[PDB]
Amino acid sequence: TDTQVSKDNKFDDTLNNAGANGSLSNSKGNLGANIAAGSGNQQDNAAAITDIYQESKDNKFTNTQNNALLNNSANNSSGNVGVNVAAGQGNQQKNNLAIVNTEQVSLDNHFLNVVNNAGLLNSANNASGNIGVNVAAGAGNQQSNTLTLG
Amino acid sequence: TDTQVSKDNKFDDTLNNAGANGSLSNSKGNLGANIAAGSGNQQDNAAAITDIYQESKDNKFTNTQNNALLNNSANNSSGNVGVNVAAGQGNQQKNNLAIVNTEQVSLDNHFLNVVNNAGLLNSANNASGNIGVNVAAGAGNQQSNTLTLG
Amino acid sequence: TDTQVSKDNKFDDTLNNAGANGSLSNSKGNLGANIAAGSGNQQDNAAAITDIYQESKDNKFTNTQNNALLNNSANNSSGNVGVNVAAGQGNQQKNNLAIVNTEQVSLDNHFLNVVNNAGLLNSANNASGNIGVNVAAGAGNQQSNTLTLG
């Protein structure tokens, strides 16, 4: 049982770059990657072979260039792959994988506004099995993946 | 069982770019991608081989150029492919895949208004099996996909 | 039972570089790495073969270039791999591994603003089993991983 909670938080604004170059190219079984470039993002990965939460209560976001990017990656993979990219302030990410519950809530928040760039370059090229990709560029996006075999 | 909920949220406005270049070109089994460029979008993917929710309660959207795009992608795929693109503020996305329930609700909201650009460049070129694409550019669009084999 | 807590803390601002060159290339069983470059980050690893907390109460962050990077690493691994990279001020990291609970909370905080660079160069190349990667560049990101076999 995992939990990730964020109560009140005052963000006031700046360069934010997050990326993955040629990497995770090959895989077997499960694989999960989450990339974000922001202020209060949340990331979580759960995988297994053979009950989680993510809360984001009141936060004051006030304001900058945000670059969340993913270059060559996850090209030739077998099994499960989950990729989530977001360039915002309060995004939430999650990946659930299995071989042979979930909840993501965002309560009251104050987003006020700045350039946000998401991205997915040459990637996910030859995926056998399962694969899920979520890309967003905003303020309060939410992403989740769920894959299984057997 | 997955869940994605967004209670009250005050969005006040800005550049938002989200895209996927030549990627996901080949696939086997299942594949799902969701791209959005906005404020409070929600993304979820569920796939398997061999009960989900998405709520969006009251949110105050007040206001910027939004660019949600997908260049070359998902060209030669075998099995299931689900792509959802939206350039708005409170869109919701979902992909359900299987080999061998669902609900998406949007309660009260306050959308007030700005350029929104969706897009689907050369993609989905040669898909064998199943494929579904949903493109929208707005404020509160909702997208969902459901594919299966066997 | 582990615990990592941070009460009030006044951070006022500077070069911060943290990286891992060609390393952790091979592995067996479990492996977990966390890299951060900031002010009040928290790191924790828990692995086993055959009840943890992480609190971050009020902290005043006021302000510098932050470089959190990971070059070649985690290439050919068997079993479980968990990598978390963050370039911020109050990020939190955790890795849970097993063969054959969790909570991460961030209470009130004061983030005020500067360049933040995350990164993942050629890595995770050929991972058999489980692997999870979380990359962020911000102020209050939170990362967690959970993998198991058997």
Residue numbers in the entry:
A (entry chain B), B (entry chain C), C (entry chain A): 45 to 57, 60 to 96, 110 to 122, 125 to 161, 173 to 185, 198 to 234
Question: Can you list sentences taken from the study reporting this PDB entry?
Answer:
An essential structural component of bacterial biofilms is functional amyloid (FuA), which also has great potential as an engineerable nano‐biomaterial. The two most well studied examples are the curli system in Escherichia coli and the fap system in Pseudomonas, in which the major aggregating protein is CsgA and FapC, respectively. A fully experimentally based 3.2 Å resolution cryo‐electron microscopy density map of the FuA protein FapC from Pseudomonas sp. UK4 is presented, which reveals a Greek key‐shaped protofilament. Each FapC monomer consists of three imperfect repeats (IRs), with each repeat forming one cross‐β layer.
